[PDB]
Amino acid sequence: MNPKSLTRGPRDKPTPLEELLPHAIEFINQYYGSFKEAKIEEHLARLEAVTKEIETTGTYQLTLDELIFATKMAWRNAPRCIGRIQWSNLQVFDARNCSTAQEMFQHICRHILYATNNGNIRSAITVFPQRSDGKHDFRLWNSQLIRYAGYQMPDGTIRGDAATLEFTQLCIDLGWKPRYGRFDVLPLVLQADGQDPEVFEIPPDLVLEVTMEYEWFQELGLKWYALPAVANMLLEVGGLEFPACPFNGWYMGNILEEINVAVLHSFQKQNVTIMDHHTASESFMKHMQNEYVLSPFYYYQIEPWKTHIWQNE
Numbered sequence: 001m002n003p004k005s006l007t008r009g010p011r012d013k014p015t016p017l018e019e020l021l022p023h024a025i026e027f028i029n030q031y032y033g034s035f036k037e038a039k040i041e042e043h044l045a046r047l048e049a050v051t052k053e054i055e056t057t058g059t060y061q062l063t064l065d066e067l068i069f070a071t072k073m074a075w076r077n078a079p080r081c082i083g084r085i086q087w088s089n090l091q092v093f094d095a096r097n098c099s100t101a102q103e104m105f106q107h108i109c110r111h112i113l114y115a116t117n118n119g120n121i122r123s124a125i126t127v128f129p130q131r132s133d134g135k136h137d138f139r140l141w142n143s144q145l146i147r148y149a150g151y152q153m154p155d156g157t158i159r160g161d162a163a164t165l166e167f168t169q170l171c172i173d174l175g176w177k178p179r180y181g182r183f184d185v186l187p188l189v190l191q192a193d194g195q196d197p198e199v200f201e202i203p204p205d206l207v208l209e210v211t212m213e214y215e216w217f218q219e220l221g222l223k224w225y226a227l228p229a230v231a232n233m234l235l236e237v238g239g240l241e242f243p244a245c246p247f248n249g250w251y252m253g254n255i256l257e258e259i260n261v262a263v264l265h266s267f268q269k270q271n272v273t274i275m276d277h278h279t280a281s282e283s284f285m286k287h288m289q290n291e292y293v294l295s296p297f298y299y300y301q302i303e304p305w306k307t308h309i310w311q312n313e
């Protein structure tokens, strides 16, 4: 077999023009090929301008429409994603002129806001600036925008998310004051322009949680977040790399002390979208109505605290 790697790592120099140009040209062709006969003079015009822009600046910028096209195509090129069947239902937020972590934070708040929509979930992606030389990367160190903290008890026990134990400790190491619940929402750990990450609490009113509701099992205090958002992948398109491009959909669906009726009832009763038969038909219908090496592609990355060179720990 000759599978490709699903990971795209860091750089420390711009992509060499001899690599970038061919990829850029191929994407431009893919994009204008989305008409099948229309816009041959526009195609050639754009090919010439991109090639001149690359040769004069060392890189190039996508138009808004090309970016939107690229995020949707990357989505339908995601083999594992079940939601990609209705891939035209994606809202794009262009944050490519973002310069600071504070600004990153505000963009992310807007995303969570729009996407959550009081439970009537909407799919969205926010695209931050593309990699330049690889030393000014924008990154979210989170794996998800919303995820619970994980604590290892003085027993060797796991309290919270058993999968975030390492990231939670890194937040503490960065100044985040550890509460010790099993449902603590991790802060946003945001890197702008290649600099050390800054910690931002997520305003709690922005976090919609499904409180699970027999009758005594709500006494357990079982709870989960409504918005599944992937924070850590890199969007590749036409030779360009976007190391920060958080996106979301909605959900598909060990001290037990096993029916999923509690979750099924809690989500659906609290009007939080999930991928049931109603939503599947409704969303595919909206999708269909919108019709009036893989690339682009979402890559995995190397966890940034393993590769980051700290300016001033």
Ligand code: HEM
Pocket: 071, 075, 078, 079, 080, 081, 082, 083, 084, 090, 123, 124, 125, 247, 248, 249, 250, 251, 252, 275, 298
């Ligand atoms: C609209 C509702 C959506 C649903 C129901 C959905 C569902 C899924 C599911 C079930 C998986 C695999 C989960 C697992 O086993 O870990 C997945 C993976 C993924 N989804 Fe979605 N998704 C949605 C929206 C999105 C959006 C908006 C994007 C991107 C623009 C997207 C991109 C991906 C990617 C990149 C993966 C990872 C593929 C891999 O692991 O190789 N999804 N999604």
Ligand SMILES: Cc1cc(N2CCC[C@@H]2C(=O)NCCc2ccc3c(c2)OCO3)nc(-n2ccnc2)n1
Pocket: 081, 144, 227, 228, 229, 230, 247, 248, 249, 250, 251, 252, 253
């Ligand atoms: C919070 C989250 C996690 C996630 N995962 C994919 C890589 C592994 C990670 C994960 O732990 N997945 C298991 C939980 C899960 C299952 C089904 C589903 C999910 C997450 O999002 C929508 O559909 N994917 C997504 N996702 C959102 C849209 N597409 C994928 N969100």
Ligand SMILES: O=S([O-])[O-]
Pocket: 088, 287, 288, 290, 291
């Ligand atoms: O744009 S897709 O729906 O043809």
